[PDB]
Design a protein around this ligand. Structure first.
Ligand SMILES: CN(CCO)Cc1cc(N)ccc1Cl
Ligand SMILES: CN(CCO)Cc1cc(N)ccc1Cl
Lengths: 237, 300
């Protein structure tokens, strides 16, 4: 059934699973036309497909050309997501295919189930968690590859960099969700926190800075303060 | 006109014949039902006074044999049987008519209700849904499950309705996943109508039969089947015009006939609201929508 607080640790067991997030697949800017009407312009998107145990991010870039001449794009976007996830699973060797796919929004369940009819043994599951994966486009290097794409394209990032050399996947996922939650609540402040110290750099093959264990504890503390803060600034507490 | 003789009525029972029904007291001198209209299937059904658990009954067509009811005190139910000795059957029927021990099938002349509920229902197709080929009549009861319910346990006592499943490889063509799921015309017209049922009459007959088993026996899997067959049509953008008009008539008489007090259990809010107000055919079921809105506006 649904993934929630009570079965959180299942994410880190040895059964292959993927999170799919479709919130950045169909993206638009809304603008005024010369006649003073409103129109949308699509911009490139991405499917966020994440193995929470290993940190594998299969980032499928959704080029604006896929929307050309299509109607009902928000509904198409869910089916396009499901089509690309199904294609990804089919591309993987049997022993790498997921046993479960957890979708972050319930509207993906039917599109994905229908596209995965060939895989009756892969469980398609919703979740009661409010995961912050929409903020993946606040990671500079992910946003950059998406916006620069001129064609459909799959890119692979370890979203945990080298963290698993030093910490568990449970802890790595908690750090990731904390960073993403912070970037979603206040991107500028979050990014200030991550980058204020010029001596701590981001390796060419990484997404996040090369913090020591001690510096991560400090970073993590600053991100929790931010999230608590914004929560007062928002609710006046 | 035809007759179904009843050996006797040893236990108190409510007897139904089609949409009619009457109360027979324990050992009351009840010997059957006469003046049954030839040309239609019929159903004779029972609810014991002592155990309203298990409504049960028999689908039959009087052209296919001489049938009678006789209580079995070992199995504890009224059983339909065929008498092959036609002389012995006319004789028994004539004696019971002379002694006026039979109730008359009480069809009002103006009234086409039963016809309209059974227009496409054919005993040959019933016998394929209800497998028991040594009898010419078909037993159904409240508890019998469908082949699809058994996939989700005694196969011999099952209702072998046509499996409809919208999230199935049968329903969904590779490469048209979104198209076929949102517009089920392929599944209706090619898979089901051309492929399995062969024509819309056989489709409507199974739909009507599922409704009638739902209503007369509270058979839950029959209700599931009836709603699924409605939904498949309503969820198809391309339906022959004649089928839409006939569907509206079929559903109209079903909704008309349903007991007001059973609407809460036999009517699926989601399917009806979807079919009447969201589906492709939301504007094509004028009679059904009018009677639904005037009779069960709560449901909507
Ligand atoms: C780093 N490698 C890729 C190198 O091309 C492992 C990997 C595989 C998938 N499928 C996704 C992400 C990663 Cl990070
Ligand atoms: C009561 N009748 C007459 C018995 O004398 C039993 C019966 C036997 C056959 N064979 C057919 C119908 C009936 Cl209803």
């Amino acid at each position: 059934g649904a993934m929630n607080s009570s079965n959180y640790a299942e994410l880190f067991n040895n059964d292959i699973k993927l999170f799919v997030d479709d919130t950045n697949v169909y993206r638009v800017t809304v603008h005024k036309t010369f006649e003073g009407n409103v129109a949308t312009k699509a911009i490139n998107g991405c499917i966020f497909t994440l193995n929470p145990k290993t940190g594998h991010l299969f980032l499928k870039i959704i080029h604006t050309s896929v929307w050309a001449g299509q109607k009902r794009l928000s509904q198409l976007a869910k089916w396009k997501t499901a089509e690309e996830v199904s294609a990804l699973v089919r591309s993987l060797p049997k022993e790498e295919q997921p046993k479960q796919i957890i979708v972050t929004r319930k509207a993906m369940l039917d599109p994905l189930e229908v596209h995965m009819l060939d895989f009756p043994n892969i469980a398609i599951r919703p979740t009661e968690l409010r995961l912050p994966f929409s903020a993946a486009m606040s990671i500079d290097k992910l946003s950059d590859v998406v916006m620069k794409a001129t064609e459909p394209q799959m890119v692979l990032f370890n979203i945990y960099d080298d963290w698993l050399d030093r910490i568990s996947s449970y802890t790595a996922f908690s750090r990731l969700t904390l960073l993403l939650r912070a970037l979603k609540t206040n991107e500028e402040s979050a990014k200030m926190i991550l980058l204020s110290d010029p001596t701590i750099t981001i390796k060419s093959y990484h997404l996040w800075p090369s913090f020591t264990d001690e510096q991560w504890i400090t970073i993590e503390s600053q991100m929790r303060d931010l999230i608590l803060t914004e929560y007062g600034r928002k609710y006046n507490v | 006109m035809n007759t179904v003789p009843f050996t006797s009525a040893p236990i108190e029972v409510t007897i139904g014949i089609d949409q009619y029904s009457f109360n027979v007291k324990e050992n009351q001198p009840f010997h059957g039902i006469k003046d049954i209209p030839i040309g239609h299937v019929h159903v004779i059904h029972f609810q014991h006074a002592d155990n309203s658990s298990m409504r049960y009954g028999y689908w039959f067509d009087c052209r296919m044999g001489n049938f009678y009811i006789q209580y079995d005190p070992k199995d504890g139910l009224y059983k339909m049987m065929e008498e092959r000795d036609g002389a012995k059957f006319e004789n028994i029927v004539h004696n019971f008519k002379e002694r006026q021990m039979m109730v008359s099938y009480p069809k009002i002349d103006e009234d086409d209700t039963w016809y309209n509920l059974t227009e496409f229902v054919q005993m040959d197709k019933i016998r394929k849904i209800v497998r028991k080929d040594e009898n010419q009549f078909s037993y159904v009861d409240s508890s019998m499950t469908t082949v699809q319910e058994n996939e989700l346990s005694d196969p011999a006592h099952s209702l072998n309705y046509t499996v409809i499943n919208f999230k199935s490889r049968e329903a969904i063509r590779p490469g048209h996943e979104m198209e076929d799921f949102l517009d089920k015309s392929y599944y209706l017209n090619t898979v089901m109508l051309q492929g399995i049922f062969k024509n819309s009459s056989n489709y409507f007959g199974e739909l009507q039969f599922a409704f009638l088993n739902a209503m007369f026996f509270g058979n839950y899997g029959s209700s599931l089947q009836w709603h699924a067959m409605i939904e498949l049509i309503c969820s198809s953008a391309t339906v022959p015009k004649h089928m839409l008009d006939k569907l509206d008539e079929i559903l109209y008489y079903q909704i008309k006939t349903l007991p007001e007090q059973y609407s809460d259990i036999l009517l699926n809010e989601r399917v009806w609201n979807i079919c009447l107000y969201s589906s492709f055919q939301k504007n094509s079921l004028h009679n059904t929508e009018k009677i639904m809105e005037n009779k069960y506006p709560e449901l909507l």
